[PDB]
């Protein structure tokens, strides 16, 4: 049972941070150290393409 | 049979109705019957999950 468990939560984890990339950052939840915005990195900026559904 | 007394009739038989019902839900198998012995059942759950795993 521990050791499934213990499988479990090294899955949800990868699933997570591959998430986190998407957004542009770095997943490193309790350590300051290792935590980076990728924007900023290597100097970019986030363009929004907003869409308007009530028109 | 015989009208009053002295008179004579044609007889035609009989009519019989039944009420409607329905069997909708035992032609789908749905449930599932245990015969038991008294009149006290016990069922047990058992629930499990994951967790978090932050940096260290």
């Not at chain 2, 329905?22 to 499990?48: C, K, P, W, Y």
Request: no cysteine; aromatic share 10%.
């Amino acid at each position: 049972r521990h050791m499934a468990r213990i499988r479990r939560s090294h899955a949800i984890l990868k699933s997570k941070a591959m998430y986190a990339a998407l957004k542009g950052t770095s997943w490193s939840p309790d350590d300051p150290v290792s935590d980076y915005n990728y924007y900023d990195v290597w100097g970019a900026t986030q363009t929004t393409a907003d869409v308007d559904f009530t028109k | 049979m015989q009208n009053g007394d002295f008179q004579i009739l044609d007889y035609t038989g009989l009519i019989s109705t039944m009420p409607r019902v329905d069997t909708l839900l035992q032609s789908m198998n749905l449930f599932t019957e245990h015969f038991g012995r008294t009149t006290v059942a016990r069922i047990e759950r058992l629930d499990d999950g994951a967790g978090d795993i932050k940096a260290v």
